Write a protein that binds this ligand. Structure first.
Ligand code: FES
Ligand code: K
Ligand code: MG
Ligand code: MG
Ligand code: MG
Ligand code: MG
Ligand code: MG
Ligand code: MG
Ligand code: MG
Ligand code: MG
Ligand code: MG
Ligand code: MG
Ligand code: MG
Ligand code: MG
Ligand code: ZN
Lengths: 174, 38, 100, 38, 162, 161, 99, 40, 177
RNA sequence: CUCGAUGUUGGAUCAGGACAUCCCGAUGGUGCAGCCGCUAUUAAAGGUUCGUUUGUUCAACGAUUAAAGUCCUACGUGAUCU
């Protein structure tokens, strides 16, 4: 179908290769991130009715992985599709006129220079972290008598409420 | 306790409150409103 | 035509007093459901070469999904379906008294 | 508008109007006469 | 009643008024001694906001109330009907007495909320964000205090505050 | 065509409840006699099965029927096996009719008999009182005499006139 | 101590239970609980609430008759109150006098 | 319930008061002999 | 009844399916009816521990009507638990956000404040419009009368009714009504 | 209430809340031309500086800022510190 105002098309799944600098004709330096599309294929189409949501969805998968390490249910799904299993599968909300047949390959030229995109991924995992690194707390002075209190949260609430509010910033997984 | 004469209106004993409520003026109500008659 | 209550659901109530006025007599025969007010019972519910055999479709479900199924089926909360400990199981009287 | 517990017309051109559930004094001749019920 | 017609013919406007058919009060009122239409028909304390057959006789074609000097109602009854008509409009019981809209005006869609016994105008009331204690509870008025004396067929009196 | 008290129809012109017109007392007196005679013939012809009755006994009321047991909460001064009549019958009912006393039915109308089958005592009832911080504590145990009665028969006679 | 004090609550809760059950049974016939209990007393029917609850469960035809009787007596009361004394007493409104 | 009504007919407010419901004998011997008077 | 013991027990303790039409009805009166049914207080065999509540199906909850100015005045308060999580919305705002919330909350507040309440709520089926699933529709038994009588609009009166009501006053013939 | 103990100022750390608003938003009045102000209505999402002396809270002073708000929270917070 032709593009219409209000139409939403599918996205991609790419691998983050690294970063690189490039300069514009005005002399300004811009660093960029290289994203390589590696074996990206449409996997499933769900109509607006069956989605349980306001829009239809199109499932995309990226990057081939070994079949020896996937669950049986996943392998039989990919067997019927006629494609090797993918590491990651993501769901893209689309309009009815943007549906693509499952099994269609997707390429980097899906996007064009000058376009603006959103990139979603899992951030780097830093494990269990204190408030200073996790939340940017100031901590306590290095000297002038501080007793085993340099990177600690301090007070976590007031005495009146006799409790800690949900959502209070505390040490934890970052 | 509070003295018999106060600057604010002193709270009444509930028995007295009931006494006042039961002894309120009830005006004579005519059978037919006088405005509805010649 | 005066009737204290409608006489179309449970019984035909007729109230009377004895001549002396010391006893109230209540005549209440049952009303039977008319035939017109009934529905008919729904009795109504290949060259296969191979004998049709029973197929077990009772796939084992995990605790969560199973409890969700039971609660929806009987319109209850999930709590009724979770087990109890030995202390409560052994306090329950297994030979309770029975009336008629 | 000045908040007032007692609204008073300050000139012959002041008029009382009830808008948005409260009384207002409006005056086109002297806008300083405008009052809002407090 | 009297109408007025404006006709522009040959770049000239003619203003005229004609006398149309006028309705007459039904004969033999049950209480001829009554001093107003309400007490002449023994209707005092016996009508409510949803009695549109009664209310519609005292309003203008666009929902406006009629003057007391014309209808002959007393101040007490005229005020009762005035409140009853406001509640009837708000309840949607007078769909053929809507305000006049100038040519080219089409109201935009607004959320439909069924309501009845509405004393105040919706737009002029604030939410009760702080209800207050039981001994000083902020109440939501229901109905009108003008109708407090209406005939009560129940043992409980009308609750005007919820 | 309007009476002095005529009121046009409004939501409050008339009461919400419907108007009820009771039967003519003269006509109803005859209809009552027919109902009493019809029920009386059912008793004479034995067109009833199991009967139940409400009897006032030991300050309280008991809905009973043949073969029932009732536990009286006191002694009755009767030897076991003795047959007695329950004389205070408030109600006797059948499948198709019921007779109500005002407040008690005549003794000629209904006869309820019972038999003493056991005279015993209740299980121990603890009575303990306690008030904190007052060294106030006392315990007492009471067993109340009881009598078990079996209802043998409920009989009605055709004495409805 | 709880066992001793529970004897008061047992009697209280039982009567609460009977009133709830009589109320449920009365509503099936379009009567409110005060109308049934109030008018049955006026007919010299001294059935207590315990028996009334048992009748509703196990004698549904007798209970409907009692509801009809109470309803009949209730309508007689209205007719009497509306009258100015001209009408004679209702058939079911007559009280049997004892001495 | 009904306490005020009973008083209007010359009866005790409580049906457990004076009257046949309370004062009449509860039982008698099946043969016919009357029972000893109740202690109450 | 002469039934066998097990069929007798089954019939007496069976669950009935009730239908209620909320169109032009105040949610409180709808809740007062549903509350009694969900608890089983309409049954002479009622007991708290007998789990004898019935099913209540309420349709047209989008068309409920409050009296007075409750649409503007009645506020529903909640708290997410987080600082600044206190939220207060009027009945009008809640109604447009969720067409079953008003009727649901009115019923939830009338049920006994015990561990059975959430089980009773499982037997309540609220639908904003006149669409009811086929399964629920097939098992309905009885429709309950609407608690409020809907007043007729002036355009719904028949000419017989209009003619029956007398004209109460004679307007002047020379008045521009 | 607590002396068979409810640790006592200011600061650090982290702040939750009120609005009687210091700044930012929207309005009425003005002895509001404009630029700046004054006063009132509405608004608590967001923000509300760094230093010299003093243990200080304050205060004075220097340099800034759209603004350097007023309060409550056991004069918030020592089983976190000083
Ligand atoms: S004079 Fe009778 S109601 Fe106005
Ligand atoms: K101390
Ligand atoms: Mg890591
Ligand atoms: Mg540091
Ligand atoms: Mg140390
Ligand atoms: Mg250190
Ligand atoms: Mg003194
Ligand atoms: Mg201690
Ligand atoms: Mg803060
Ligand atoms: Mg403010
Ligand atoms: Mg702030
Ligand atoms: Mg402190
Ligand atoms: Mg320490
Ligand atoms: Mg501490
Ligand atoms: Zn002025």
């Amino acid at each position: 179908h032709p593009w219409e105002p209000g139409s939403f098309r599918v996205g991609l799944i790419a691998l983050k290769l690294g970063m690189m600098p490039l300069w514009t004709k005005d002399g300004q330096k811009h660093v960029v991130t290289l994203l390589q599309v590696q074996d990206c294929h449409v996997l499933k189409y769900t109509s607006k009715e069956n989605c349980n949501g306001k829009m239809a969805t199109l499932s995309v998968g990226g990057k081939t992985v070994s079949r020896f390490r996937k669950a049986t249910s996943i392998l039989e799904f990919y067997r019927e599709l006629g494609l090797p299993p993918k590491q990651t599968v993501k769901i893209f909300n689309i309009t009815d006129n943007a549906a693509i047949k499952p099994g269609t390959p997707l390429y980097a030229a899906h996007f064009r220079p000058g376009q603006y995109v959103d990139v979603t991924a899992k951030t780097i995992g830093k494990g269990f972290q204190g408030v200073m690194k996790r939340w940017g707390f100031k901590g306590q002075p290095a000297t002038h008598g501080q007793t085993k209190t340099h990177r600690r949260p301090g007070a976590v609430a007031t005495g009146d409420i006799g409790r800690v509010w949900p959502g209070t910033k505390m040490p934890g997984k970052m | 306790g509070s003295k018999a004469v106060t600057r604010h209106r002193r709270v009444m004993h509930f028995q007295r409150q009931k006494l006042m409520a039961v002894t309120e003026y009830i005006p004579p109500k005519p059978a037919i409103h006088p405005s509805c008659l010649p | 035509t005066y009737s204290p209550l409608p006489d179309d659901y449970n019984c035909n109530v007729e109230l009377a007093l004895t001549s002396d006025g010391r006893t109230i007599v209540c005549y209440h025969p049952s009303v039977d459901i008319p035939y017109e007010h009934t529905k008919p019972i729904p009795r109504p519910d290949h060259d296969q070469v191979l004998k049709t055999r029973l197929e077990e479709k009772v796939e084992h479900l995990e605790e969560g999904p199973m409890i969700e199924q039971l609660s929806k089926m009987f319109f209850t909360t999930k709590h009724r379906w979770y087990p109890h400990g030995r202390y409560h199981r052994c306090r329950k009287n297994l030979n309770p008294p029975k009336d008629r | 508008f000045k908040n007032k517990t007692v609204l008073k017309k300050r000139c012959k051109d002041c008029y009382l109007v009830k808008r948005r559930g409260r009384w207002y004094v409006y005056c086109k001749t002297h806008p300083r006469h405008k009052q809002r019920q407090m | 009643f009297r109408e007025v017609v404006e006709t522009q013919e040959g770049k000239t406007t003619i203003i005229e008024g004609r006398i149309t058919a006028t309705p007459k009060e039904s004969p033999n009122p049950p209480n001829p001694s009554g001093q107003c239409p309400i007490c002449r028909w023994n209707l005092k304390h016996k009508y409510n906001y949803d009695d549109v057959l009664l209310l519609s006789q005292f309003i203008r074609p666009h929902g406006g109330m009629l003057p007391r000097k014309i209808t002959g109602l007393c101040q007490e009854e005229h005020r009762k009907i005035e409140e009853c008509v406001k509640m009837a409009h708000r309840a949607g019981l007078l769909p053929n007495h809507r305000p006049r809209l100038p040519e080219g005006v089409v109201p935009k869609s607004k959320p439909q909320l069924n309501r009845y016994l509405t004393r105040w105008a919706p737009g002029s009331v604030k939410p009760i964000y702080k209800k207050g204690p039981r001994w000083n509870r902020v109440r939501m008025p229901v109905g009108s205090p003008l109708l407090r004396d209406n005939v009560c067929y129940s043992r409980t009196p009308w609750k005007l505050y919820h | 065509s309007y009476l002095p008290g005529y009121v046009p129809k409004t939501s409050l012109s008339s009461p919400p409840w419907p108007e009820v017109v009771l039967p003519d007392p003269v006509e109803e007196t005859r209809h009552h006699a027919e109902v009493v005679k019809k029920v009386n013939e059912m008793i004479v012809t034995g067109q009833y099965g199991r009967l139940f009755a409400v009897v006032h006994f030991a300050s309280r009321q008991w809905k009973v029927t043949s073969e029932d047991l009732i536990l009286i909460g006191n002694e009755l001064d009767l030897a076991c096996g003795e047959r007695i009549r329950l004389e205070k019958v408030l109600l006797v009912g059948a499948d198709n009719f019921t007779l109500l006393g005002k407040p008690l039915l005549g003794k000629d109308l209904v006869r309820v008999e019972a038999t003493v089958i056991e005279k015993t005592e209740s299980w121990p009832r603890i009575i303990m009182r306690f008030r904190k911080r007052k060294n106030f504590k006392k315990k007492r145990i009471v067993t109340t005499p009881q009598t078990v009665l079996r209802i043998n028969s409920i009989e009605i006679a055709p004495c409805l006139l | 101590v709880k066992c001793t004090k529970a004897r008061y609550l047992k009697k209280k809760n039982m009567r609460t239970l009977w009133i709830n059950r009589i109320t449920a049974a009365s509503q099936e016939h379009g009567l409110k609980y005060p109308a049934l209990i109030g008018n049955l007393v006026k007919c010299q029917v001294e059935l207590n609430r315990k028996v009334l609850a048992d009748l509703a469960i196990y004698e549904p035809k007798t209970f409907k008759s009692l509801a009809a009787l109470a309803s009949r007596r209730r309508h007689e009361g209205f007719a009497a109150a509306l009258g100015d004394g001209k009408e004679p007493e209702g058939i079911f409104s007559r009280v049997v006098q004892y001495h | 319930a009904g306490g005020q009504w009973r008083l209007q007919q010359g009866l005790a407010a409580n049906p457990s008061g004076y009257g046949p419901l309370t004062e009449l004998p509860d039982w008698s011997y099946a043969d016919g002999r009357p029972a000893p008077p109740m202690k109450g | 009844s002469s039934f066998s013991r097990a069929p007798q027990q089954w019939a007496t303790f069976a669950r009935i399916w009730y239908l209620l039409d909320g169109k032009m009805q105040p949610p409180g009166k709808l809740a007062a009816m549903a509350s009694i049914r969900l608890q089983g207080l309409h049954k002479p065999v009622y007991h708290a521990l007998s789990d004898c509540g019935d099913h209540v199906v309420i349709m047209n909850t989008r068309h409920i009507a409050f009296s007075g100015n409750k649409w503007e005045q009645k506020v529903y308060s909640s708290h997410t638990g987080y600082p600044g999580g206190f939220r207060q919305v009027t009945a009008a705002q809640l109604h447009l956000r969720d067409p079953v919330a008003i009727v649901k909350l009115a019923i939830y507040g009338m049920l006994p404040k015990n561990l059975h309440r959430r089980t009773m709520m499982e037997r309540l089926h609220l639908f904003p419009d006149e669409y009811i699933p086929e399964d629920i529709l097939k098992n309905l038994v009885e429709e309950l009368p609407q608690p409020r009588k809907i007043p007729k609009r002036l355009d719904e009166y028949t000419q017989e009714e209009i003619d029956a009501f007398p004209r109460l006053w004679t307007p002047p013939e020379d008045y521009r009504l």
